[PDB]
Amino acid sequence: MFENITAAPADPILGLADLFRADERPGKINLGIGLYYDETGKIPVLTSVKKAEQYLLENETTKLYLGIDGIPEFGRCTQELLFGKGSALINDKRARTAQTPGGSGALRVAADFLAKNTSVKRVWVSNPSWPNHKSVFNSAGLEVREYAYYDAENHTLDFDALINSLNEAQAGDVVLFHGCCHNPTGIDPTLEQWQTLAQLSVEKGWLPLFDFAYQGFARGLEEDAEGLRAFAAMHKELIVASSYSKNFGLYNERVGACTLVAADSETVDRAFSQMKAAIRANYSSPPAHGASVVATILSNDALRAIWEQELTDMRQRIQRMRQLFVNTLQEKGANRDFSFIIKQNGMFSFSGLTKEQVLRLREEFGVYAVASGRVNVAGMTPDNMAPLCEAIVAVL
Amino acid sequence: MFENITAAPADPILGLADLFRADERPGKINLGIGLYYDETGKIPVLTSVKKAEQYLLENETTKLYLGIDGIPEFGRCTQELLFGKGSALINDKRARTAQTPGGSGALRVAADFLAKNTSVKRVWVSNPSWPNHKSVFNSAGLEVREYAYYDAENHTLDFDALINSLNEAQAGDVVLFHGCCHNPTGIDPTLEQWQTLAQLSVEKGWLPLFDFAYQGFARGLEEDAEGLRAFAAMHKELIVASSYSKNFGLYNERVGACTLVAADSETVDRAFSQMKAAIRANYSSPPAHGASVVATILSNDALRAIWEQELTDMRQRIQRMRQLFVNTLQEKGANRDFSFIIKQNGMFSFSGLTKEQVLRLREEFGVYAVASGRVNVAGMTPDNMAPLCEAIVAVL
Ligand SMILES: *Cc1c(COP(=O)(O)O)cnc(C)c1O
Ligand SMILES: *Cc1c(COP(=O)(O)O)cnc(C)c1O
């Protein structure tokens, strides 16, 4: 029955980790997958987290199934993180949150939900975008179309080209936005542009879906939510697929959430009940661990304090790594100018190397980047910075 | 966009959880959802589990993403527990295992895989069956048909009906089987009946799918795997969705596995690549916690010894509650004769109660059972047995 199955091509991201973990080369450098690395080159468990886990070890008394939608407290905290402590969304009880296995699980949950309870047929994703977006949506039976975004010869956000592209989107179409830290470009809309898109989308009748996986890595917690918050003030309905993988260093515990908003309580409850049915036919209930971690920290004043500090440290190192990177490129006598890299934000930088420069960088020097030329700046360290820049310069 | 969404009906199982939580009557009794309770009435965290957890707290240095298929050790152990220590399956390298978020997530992973890579169009589930089977499969765009199973009158396995009904399954159809501890009848075939079924299925051309969620609750780890093992010797291709939720008391951590078997190593490999693609478009990678716990305990001779005893205790306690239940029923007044209950395996007995009788026990005596009349014997304690057998008798 399987005699005919065809071999799938491997994940452009997840697949590279396999090649990586296979070269027996001494000085290999991994700048592919979106992990945060410290000065010493490791991917540490944060301390606030270790503290939270200790607490859990002492205090848990049962492993009793969670409800479909997970931990209440977790949902509450996510909302305020998301909309504000103040908010009317929260005040009017307009939103409902489901804890899912990572922000990947939330995307799928939303897709399954949309495909089965709405008249949605297409979803609009930026170009370029996170490669898994297409697979998730196609998996639910939805079609994906792209909208212009990135201005390659200037490394910018091509606003009108983005807007003109969107004019092709019909009313009732889904349009996907990246909260902040655009993956893989690192180019984000300003607050004005966010406001414009908000208005437009209200006129054109689109349903907004925000992919929020980097809250806190651009400028800060509250200010990273600005774009989302502007949309929220104008819309009656929207979906937020959020992740705690990067901001809590909880990658393998799978912690994310799916937030549903409707014009009002009665509607949202009705709507959510179906979202629940979609979950039940998937993984049933969500994994407690990582989510208990996040709820514990967000719920405790001390731990939260530590956590925020650990987060601000993460963000700053990355910003340091980015200046260090171009300066060194410079000193190493790089052809082009790479100063645009200083303007982007988050873990990734769109380097501008070609398919075959990245292919070369790898076969030849053990430097691992994603085919699109996306580079993980958080994987860079003062110790690997020269060898790195020396390889790049050698291929350009 | 969400204005016309209709409210979903509640889950026969999970839904009761909700009502239970909200019921304020003091002496309530829960015999709904499949959770193991102790003499004192709690869902405790096993000792071997708390140990393994301590070990993790101390030894973990990273939260790094696991791979699509999870922790290699986990899969290795799972295959041994499943096929036995030195199986040819393991030796020939025919099976491949993916770690999933519970047995639920394994079921779904298999459905998505099947629906997309094979020409499978329909799935055969027993009557009666675990309510969620239907939903998972339908979600994948698969048809679910039913096969005769239980004989209500003499409360037993009707082999002819079972056999005669399958007679309509076509070649290339999936036939789903319960490893042991039939949910919800508690009626399992004999080894001899297992052997018969194993021959038909081959002759007839079916693709067997085993739902294995109660390994260890019938007779023992190995004994419990017989039917599966007999199937494994004749078949070329097989699917296994297993759960560690009940045998490890790890309910909310979501630990399960999906094992894919092919005629050979190359085929299975090729096939598994697709299964992996299906997972990437779903939740990406699995939750580390509970799986780490399982691998830790299975790979350490000492922790393993403790666990197997903990598990033996569970099974034993349950069988005690069985006989206590009938005796008390009788000596307390019952009209009917519930002795058939002594011959079922697992957490659950099919009580023979009416939809009206279960509604009533709920509404009137605070006793929670599932509408089909399935009761959780493992939710019964020596302290609640009195008031319980009284409620029942009063509705007879
Ligand atoms: C990492 C990432 C995701 C998926 O997040 P997980 O929490 O790892 O499932 C989704 N979208 C973007 C833009 C991401 O960077
Ligand atoms: C419990 C159970 C499952 C799913 O269990 P998980 O909690 O997701 O591991 C599947 N099938 C049967 C028959 C079960 O009893």
Measure the CA–CA gap between B149 and B133, rounded to whole angstroms: 16
Measure the CA–CA gap between B364 and B272, rounded to whole angstroms: 52
Q: Are A175 and A205 in contact (CB under 8 A)?
A: no
Give the residue among A293, A103, A212 at the shortest CA–CA distance from B284.
Answer: A103
Give the residue among B252, B282, B64, B107 at the shortest CA–CA distance from A74.
Answer: B252
CB atoms within 10 A of CB A341: 20
CATH 3.40.640.10 in chain A: give the residue spans.
Answer: 45-315
Report whether the peptide linkage leading into residue B128 is cis, meaning its omega lies within 30 degrees of zero.
Answer: yes
Measure the CA–CA gap between B2 and A235, rounded to whole angstroms: 13
Grouping H, G, I as helix, E, B as strand and the rest as coil, residue B150 is: strand
Most A-contacting residue of B3, B4, B5, B268 (CB-CB within 10 A), to test interface: B5
Measure the CA–CA gap between B305 and B394, rounded to whole angstroms: 45
Give the residue among B109, B141, B108, B142 at the shortest CA–CA distance from B124.
Answer: B142
Pocket test for ligand 1, best of A149, A182, A183 (most atoms within 8 A of CB): A183
Report which residue type is found at B52.
Answer: A
One-letter-per-residue 3-state SS of A130-182: CCHHHHHHHHHCCEEEEEECEECCCCEECHHHHHHHHCCCCCCCEEEEECCCC
**φ, ψ (nearest 5 deg) of residue A366:** 70, 20
Measure the CA–CA gap between A102 and A253, rounded to whole angstroms: 8
Query: What resolution in angstrom units was achieved for this structure?
Result: 2.3
Q: Are A72 and A232 in contact (CB under 8 A)?
A: no
Strand ranges, E, within A214-308: 238-243, 256-261
Pocket test for ligand 1, best of A33, A177, A185, A211 (most atoms within 8 A of CB): A211
Distances (CA, A) of B256 to A213, B39, B155, B244, B296: 26, 27, 31, 6, 15
B251 with A68: Cβ contact below 8 A: no
Paired strand residues for A368: A30
Longest dimension (CA), chain A: 63
B254 with A43: Cβ contact below 8 A: no
A253 with B63: Cβ contact below 8 A: yes
User: Which residues of chain A make contact with B281, given a CB cutoff of 8 A?
Assistant: 108, 132, 135-136, 138-139
B281 with A138: Cβ contact below 8 A: yes
Q: Tell me if residue B337 is catalytic.
A: no
Give the residue among A241, A242, A232, A240 at the shortest CA–CA distance from A263.
Answer: A232
B130 close to ligand 2 (CB < 6 Angstrom) = yes
Measure the CA–CA gap between B326 and B143, rounded to whole angstroms: 39
Measure the CA–CA gap between B342 and B321, rounded to whole angstroms: 10
Measure the CA–CA gap between B254 and A63, rounded to whole angstroms: 10
Q: Tell me if residue B92 is catalytic.
A: no
CB-nearest to A280 from B11, B65, B117 is: B11
User: Got the DSSP string for B191-249?
Assistant: HHHHHHHHHHHHHHT-EEEEEE--TTSSS-TTGGGHHHHHHHHH-S-EEEEEE-TTTSS
Report which residue type is found at B114.
Answer: L
Structure tokens at B73: 């050790």
Paired strand residues for A210: A177, A240
Give the β-pairing of A156-157 and A150-151: antiparallel
CATH 3.90.1150.10 in chain B: give the residue spans.
Answer: 11-44+316-396
End-to-end CA separation in angstroms for chain B: 49
HSE value, Cβ hemisphere, 13 Å, CA-based, for B13: 20
Solving technique: X-ray
Structure tokens at B331: 């000596």
Give the residue among A122, A187, A200, A176 at the shortest CA–CA distance from A350.
Answer: A187
Q: Are A212 and A231 in contact (CB under 8 A)?
A: no
HSE value, Cβ hemisphere, 13 Å, CA-based, for B125: 21
Give the residue among B255, B267, B283 at the shortest CA–CA distance from B117.
Answer: B267
B183 close to ligand 2 (CB < 6 Angstrom) = yes
Residues 6+ apart with CB under 8 A from A79: A87, A89, A90, A95, A97, A259
For residue A347, give the DSSP letter. S
Ligand in closest contact with the CA of B181? 2
Structure tokens at A120: 């949605």
The alpha-carbon radius of gyration of chain B (Å, integer) is 21
Q: Tell me if residue A188 is catalytic.
A: no
Q: Give the gap in angstroms from C-alpha B167 to the nearest C-alpha of chain A.
A: 20
Distances (CA, A) of B373 to A91, A321, B315: 42, 63, 22
Measure the CA–CA gap between B302 and B297, rounded to whole angstroms: 8
Residues 6+ apart with CB under 8 A from B73: B295, B298, B299
End-to-end CA separation in angstroms for chain A: 48
Give the residue among B171, B160, B232, B162 at the shortest CA–CA distance from B204.
Answer: B171
**φ, ψ (nearest 5 deg) of residue A348:** -105, 150
Residue A24 burial by Cβ neighbours in a 10 Å radius (0-12, 13-18, 19+): exposed
Paired strand residues for B376: B348
B284 close to ligand 1 (CB < 6 Angstrom) = yes
Structure tokens at A166: 């969107």
Distances (CA, A) of B252 to A264, A289, B31, B109: 31, 8, 19, 19
CA angle B46, B48, B49 (to 5 degrees): 65
Structure tokens at B212: 């294995």
A34 close to ligand 1 (CB < 6 Angstrom) = yes
A184 close to ligand 1 (CB < 6 Angstrom) = no
- Taking each helix axis as running N to C, give the angle between helix A72-83 and helix A226-234, from 0 to 180 degrees, rounded to the nearest 10: 90
Which CATH class for the A11-44+316-396 domain? Answer: alpha beta
Measure the CA–CA gap between B121 and B263, rounded to whole angstroms: 22
The active-site residue, picked from B112, B188, B206, B246, is B246
Give the residue among A62, A77, A67, A135 at the shortest CA–CA distance from A100.
Answer: A67
User: Got the DSSP string for A16-80?
Assistant: HHHHHTT---TT-EE--S-----TTS--PPPHHHHHHHHHHHHH-------BTTB-HHHHHHHHH
Distances (CA, A) of A313 to A36, A307, A310, B45: 11, 10, 5, 36
Which CATH class for the B45-315 domain? Answer: alpha beta
Measure the CA–CA gap between A64 and B31, rounded to whole angstroms: 14
The b/e string for B72-93 (b: 16+ C-beta within 10 A; e otherwise) is: ebbbebbbebbbbeebebbeee
- Taking each helix axis as running N to C, give the angle between helix B355-365 and helix B385-395, from 0 to 180 degrees, rounded to the nearest 10: 130
The active-site residue, picked from A173, A211, A224, A307, is A211
Q: Are B299 and B72 in contact (CB under 8 A)?
A: no
Residues 6+ apart with CB under 8 A from A292: A52, A56, A60, A71
One-letter-per-residue 3-state SS of A358-383: HHHHHHHHCEECCCCCEEEHHHCCCC
- Summarize the annotated binding site of B for L-aspartate as residue ranges: 34, 130, 183, 374
